[PDB]
Amino acid sequence: SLYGQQQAYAEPFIEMMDTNPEFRDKRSYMKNEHNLHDVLKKFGNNPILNAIILTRSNQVAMYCQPARYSEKGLGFEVRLRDLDAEPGRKEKEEMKRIEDFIVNTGKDKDVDRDSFQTFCKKIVRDTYIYDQVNFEKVFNKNNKTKLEKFIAVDPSTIFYATDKKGKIIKGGKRFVQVVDKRVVASFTSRELAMGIRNPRTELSSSGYGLSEVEIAMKEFIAYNNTESFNDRFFSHGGTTRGILQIRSDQQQSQHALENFKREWKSSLSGINGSWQIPVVMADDIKFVNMTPTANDMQFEKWLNYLINIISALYGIDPAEIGFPNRGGATQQSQNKGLQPLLRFIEDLVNRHIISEYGDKYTFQFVGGDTKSATDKLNILKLETQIFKTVNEAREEQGKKPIEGGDIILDASFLQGTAQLQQDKQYNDGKQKERLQMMMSL
Amino acid sequence: SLYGQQQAYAEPFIEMMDTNPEFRDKRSYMKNEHNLHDVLKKFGNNPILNAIILTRSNQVAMYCQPARYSEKGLGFEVRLRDLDAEPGRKEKEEMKRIEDFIVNTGKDKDVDRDSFQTFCKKIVRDTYIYDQVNFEKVFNKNNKTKLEKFIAVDPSTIFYATDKKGKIIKGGKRFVQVVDKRVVASFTSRELAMGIRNPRTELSSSGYGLSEVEIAMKEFIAYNNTESFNDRFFSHGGTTRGILQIRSDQQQSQHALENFKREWKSSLSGINGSWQIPVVMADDIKFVNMTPTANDMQFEKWLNYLINIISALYGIDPAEIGFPNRGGATQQSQNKGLQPLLRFIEDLVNRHIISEYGDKYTFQFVGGDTKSATDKLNILKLETQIFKTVNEAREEQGKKPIEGGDIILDASFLQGTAQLQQDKQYNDGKQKERLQMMMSL
Questions:
Q1: d(C-alpha B47, C-alpha B66), whole Å
Q2: Torsion angles phi and psi, residue B72, rounded to 5
Q3: Where does Zn(2+) bind (chains A, B) (predicted)?
Q4: Which helix (H) or strand (E) holds B347?
Q5: What burial class does residue A172 get, using C-beta atoms within 10 Å of its C-beta: 0-12 exposed, 13-18 middle, 19+ buried?
Q6: Which residues make beta-bridge pairs with B365?
Q7: Which of A84, B32, B52, B322 is deepest in the core (most CB within 10 A)?
């Protein structure tokens, strides 16, 4: 079963003829194709698709460092789940260790291993080519419970493993790695993640994703063709402006025509000839125009239309990649497109890595804050009216408490205490004079 | 192994026929080419690509000096990792030494060695041509643990070394330098860095990067062709405006025609002839127009389109390099393109150089601050209400404490202490009169 024991079927009830009994084929949406990822692999060098992948992965790479060490606060942090909790002495260190582990992508430092930045750039590229992310989790050999590394794996090699009954394996070796159409490795759900952005309930989708490259493939082909068309004017075309027709009772001999070519070029070619005019006394002379006097690119609107569609599927403003936005206006779309990718990476990290440390922690990317010394002083300038005595503030600075602190900085607070002092001095007088009268009587 | 021992294969399982058993070839994306960097080397003189490389490396060069000595605060600094730590007496000097070492690119001063500026300009050029940065680390001959120099190395000469089993070497001499297709040097991971901006999980990518010159190569070729086309009007073209057809019962002899050319030029050429009109009494006279009356460049939109694509791959505004932005609007893109390059250089420096000094330190580029004397006085003008006595402020200035300091500059603070004084004088009176009554009784 794909998810678990259920009485609704979640896979094709009759076993479709997969090429191999051991794994589920990545069939195209229409089943017109069975090797979809080798189709999509051909577009991974497309310049528009790479402009999208590079702009997004450059945006993502800025978060990869820890916010803890980044004075602007931009980055990621490992945090307790509850905002109300205060972390214990050991929890603060465990969170710092998990942060360090993520940064190093593993327990020890090793320059030969990917950084978290390289990992994120990899999986972003994989999401936007394949809509499939995989990374292997490597556990300590002596202690299978202890995670040592996580490494990104080529998604085109990873397939769901299938039982002889055609059911997807659960609980066992759920995944296989296939190279040259033989299984070279296998993995449990514990050892390999799979992440998908565009899920489907469709039974024949078999749990695989859906690439925008598949959806937009016609548009990419049309783009490629219009690019080749415009380039072939130079690469393959006839640029010839026209034909100079000279006509007389009979055509010139080839010798005559070649020394007429010498008369021409020695008198009229280049800068040296540039403003001379030939005189010719042929019976008639005509020039036939075969091209426009002013050539430029064609199908510009067609290209714009195509790229507006492809950008709309990926959720990017064409203006970000150098194309007119046919909507005619518009940052908001950048935010709307980048935030889901960040959340997807967060979801993967939380489910697969942090879950080794248990549910008390959470991994989140965090933006900066507008909490300068000025802003903190404005806040405390209100908190000292509302809450804080001078000495609480100074203690929060690590500055020694002062005699004459322990007061709120409000004139009414002091006017109250000045009242209460008099109240005390009156009750003291009243009670002492009562006692003195009782002792007199 | 590329990264480390793993059960997922990270390289082509069957050894592909590399040209040499000893190193991994830099195959093109489609494997259409095996000598990719000698292809890319031909574009390193491209004017558009150099306009990008020069504008970026000029932007980067401003950071290269230390912020410590730069009164505007712009530059780099070596810092403790934790923002909460206060550096020890020896740590402050070690950080200054590491800064000096970076500036000098080595232990001693030597005018023959690259400065950090020259190093950064080099590796920026290398990133944007090859997407591969290499620098060698040279250790002291007497003490292999002590770093003496780091020097940038030609990335086109550096290849991954491969075992006889076709596996990339790890732990040993991971890198070789190849010149004239023979190995002239070898390096461990300790002795040579490799940096890559555009990583791939693709098994056949073999750990190498992906140049935008490779992706955009068709666009660069189209650009080159359209430039040659527009130049060849002058360099090679016929600029001839038209043919003056004069016609009569028979063509003039060559002698007649050459002395007609003398009659023409002596009467009509240059400024001297400029406003005279010839009278001619031929049977018929015709002028055939062979070019437009007003010539200008062609395919301007095509060029703009191409450069907008190339700029979008590199992440630069065309307006920065003298082209219309086809998006029609837009600094933000400059920031978005320069910040990743800075972070990449930071990541390389942290992983490879600072790591010799251990994880307690961090290298970062830092911008200036808006912390003039005015801003500091505004901040302290609030801190002296919220936190600081006069004497703490003066001590922070190195100015002697004054009698009548030790007070917060708030009227309520003084009104409180003026209360508390009276409170003391009352309790003093009460307690002394209590004692005097006890002694009387």
A1: 32
A2: -75, -5
A3: 263
A4: helix B332-352
A5: exposed
A6: B76
A7: B52
Report how far residue B352's alpha carbon sits from residue B356's, in angstroms, rounded to the nearest whole number. Answer: 7
On the CB side of A215, how many CA atoms lie within 13 Å of its CA? Answer: 15
b/e code B252-261 from CB counts within 10 Å (16+ = b): eeeeeeeeee
The residue among A138, A133, A137 whose CA lies nearest residue A158 is: A133
- DSSP one-letter code for B357: G
Q: How far apart are alpha carbons B344 and B17 in whole angstroms?
A: 33
Q: Which residues contact B86 (CB under 8 A, 6 or more apart)?
A: none
Instruction: Go through A83-108 and write b for each residue having 16 or more CB atoms within 10 A of its CB, e for each that does not.
Output: eeeeeeeeeeebbeebbebbbbbbee
Q: CB of A213 within 8 A of CB of A43?
A: yes
Neighbours of A334 (CB within 10 A): 19
CB A40 within 8 A of CB A129: yes
Judge contact between B80 and B365, C-beta under 8 A.
Answer: no
Residue B175 token pair: 């890198």
Q: Which two tokens stand for residue A261?
A: 């070519």
Resolution in A: 3.6
Instruction: Quote the tokens at residue A394.
Output: 């100074």
User: Please, are residues A163 and A169 in contact by the beta-carbon 8 Å criterion?
Assistant: yes
Say how far apart CA A285 and CA B286 lie, in whole Å. Answer: 9
Chain A segment 121-150 residues within 8 A of B by beta carbon are 121-122, 125-126, 136, 138, 149
CA A272 to chain centre: 58
The DSSP letter of residue B114 is P
User: Chain A, 20-79: which have a CB under 8 Å from a chain B CB?
Assistant: 41, 44-45, 47-48, 50-51, 54-55, 58-59, 61-62, 65, 68-69, 71
Residues of A in contact with B248 (CB under 8 A): 281
